[PDB]
Amino acid sequence: GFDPYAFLTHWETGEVSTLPSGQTLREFNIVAVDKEIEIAPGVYFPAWTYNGQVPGPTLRVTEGDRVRVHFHNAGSHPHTIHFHGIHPASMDGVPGTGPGMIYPGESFTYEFDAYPFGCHLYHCHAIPLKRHIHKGLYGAFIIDPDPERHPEYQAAARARLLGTPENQAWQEFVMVMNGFDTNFDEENEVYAVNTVAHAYMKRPIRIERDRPVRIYLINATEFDPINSFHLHANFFDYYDHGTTLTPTLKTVDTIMQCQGQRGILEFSFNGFEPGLYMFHAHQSEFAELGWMGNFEVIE
């Protein structure tokens, strides 16, 4: 069922309402379920999934929102959701606090205010740690800045806030670097952005020349210490964790992340000759094994 092309630009914004205090509330339903995923045609991986897909749903909210994630375990092992973000210890999704792990058939609502703004992620933190992550229990968590709380960077914040006219000008994509050890010997056999090896070689990502591009880039790769992103023929600005509104790194073409690191890349192909522009890990073996894709820059 998983569609890596639709996944690129799918934002789950939840069912929105207003709390008695006036605070915006966003509610999400997440079910852990054991399910086959196809990481290449005829390559079946037995995954543990959030909502039947790997990566899990890309959750996207605004700084200051109240977030409720109704988590139900319909799997066979205990699971949690550990968010990278600010929240109480009892909402941290680790085995030793709060409700602990959520056992098969049980439910729990993670609830917190969405801080800090930036690019984040969530993943299972069960026993043992590496197993539940590698099996597929990870996803993206994006907290848009509230432009009313950043007057000194108003234009930047508005460009990131989903649905403003300024944000509609941007071409936004979410990319989770992941990998799979199909024979379960703690070494990856397949690498990818968004699970399907070479998916963006088979169908390049169409890019309109005149508009800028923003990527929310997350490293969920297990076993290997780092992953990386190299943009052919062009340079980008990098925002580590996306937690600042000015770049961490200006004018680079290769960055690296250990697992759990992530950030925002911004660049533009304005004025570029139309054609295919490659992007891939600069660990060459990862790129050969599926972590390589093409932007199709059109005029």
Q: What angle do CA 71, 1, 56 make, to 5 degrees?
A: 35
Q: Per rule CB under 8 A, is residue 97 in the interface with a second copy?
A: yes
> For the window 7-36, what string marks contact with Cu ion as x by the rule CB under 5 A?
------------------------------
Mapped onto helix, strand or coil, the DSSP state of residue 220 is: coil
Q: What, of Cu ion, Mg ion, a second copy, none, does residue 259 touch, CB below 5 to 8 Å by kind?
A: a second copy
Q: Can you name the residues that pair with 92 across neighbouring β-strands?
A: none
267-296 residues in contact with a second copy (CB under 8 A) are: 272-278, 282-285, 287-288, 294
Q: What, of Cu ion, a second copy, Mg ion, none, does residue 92 touch, CB below 5 to 8 Å by kind?
A: a second copy
Say how far apart CA 217 and CA 91 lie, in whole Å. Answer: 25
Number of CB atoms found within 10 A of residue 16's CB: 12
| Alpha helices, DSSP H, located in 65-189 | 129-134, 154-160, 165-169
Provide the minimum distance between the beta carbon of 230 and Cu ion in the complex, in angstroms, as a whole number: 6
113 known ligand binder? no
Q: Per rule CB under 8 A, is residue 249 in the interface with a second copy?
A: yes
Tell which residue, 64, 68, 71, 61, has the closest CA to residue 115: 64
Say how far apart CA 281 and CA 257 lie, in whole Å. Answer: 11
Q: Per rule CB under 8 A, is residue 9 in the interface with a second copy?
A: no
Q: Per rule CB under 8 A, is residue 202 in the interface with a second copy?
A: yes
Mapped onto helix, strand or coil, the DSSP state of residue 90 is: helix
Nearer to Cu ion, 24 or 243 (CB): 243
Tell which residue, 154, 144, 169, has the closest CA to residue 26: 144
Q: What, of Cu ion, a second copy, Mg ion, none, does residue 79 touch, CB below 5 to 8 Å by kind?
A: Cu ion
Please state whether beta strands 15-18 and 24-40 pair in parallel, antiparallel, or not at all (unpaired): antiparallel
Residue 70 · residue 39 · CB < 8 Å: no
Q: Per rule CB under 8 A, is residue 68 in the interface with a second copy?
A: no
Q: Per rule CB under 5 A, is residue 262 in the interface with Cu ion?
A: no
132-191 residues in contact with Mg ion (CB under 5 A) are: 181, 183, 185, 187, 189
Mapped onto helix, strand or coil, the DSSP state of residue 155 is: helix
Provide the minimum distance between the beta carbon of 78 and Cu ion in the complex, in angstroms, as a whole number: 7
> Among the candidate windows 18-26, 60-68, 156-164, 198-206, which touches a second copy by CB under 8 A?
198-206
44-63 residues in contact with Cu ion (CB under 5 A) are: none
Tell which residue, 155, 139, 150, 166, has the closest CA to residue 117: 150
Size of the residue set binding Mg ion (CB under 5 A): 5
Q: What, of a second copy, Cu ion, Mg ion, none, does residue 185 touch, CB below 5 to 8 Å by kind?
A: Mg ion
User: What contacts 187, CB < 8 A, 6 or more positions away?
Assistant: 181, 223
Nearer to Mg ion, 134 or 280 (CB): 134
Number of CB atoms found within 10 A of residue 99's CB: 17
**CA-CA-CA-CA torsion for 188, 7, 266, 155, nearest 10 degrees?**
-140
> Which residues of this chain interact with Cu ion, rule CB under 5 A?
79, 124, 126, 132, 137, 260
* Binding-site residue positions for Cu(2+): 79, 84, 123-124, 132, 282
* Binding-site residue positions: 20, 79, 84, 96, 99, 101, 106, 123-124, 132, 181, 183, 185, 187, 189, 282
* Binding-site residue positions for Ca(2+): 20, 96, 99, 101, 106, 181, 183, 185, 187, 189
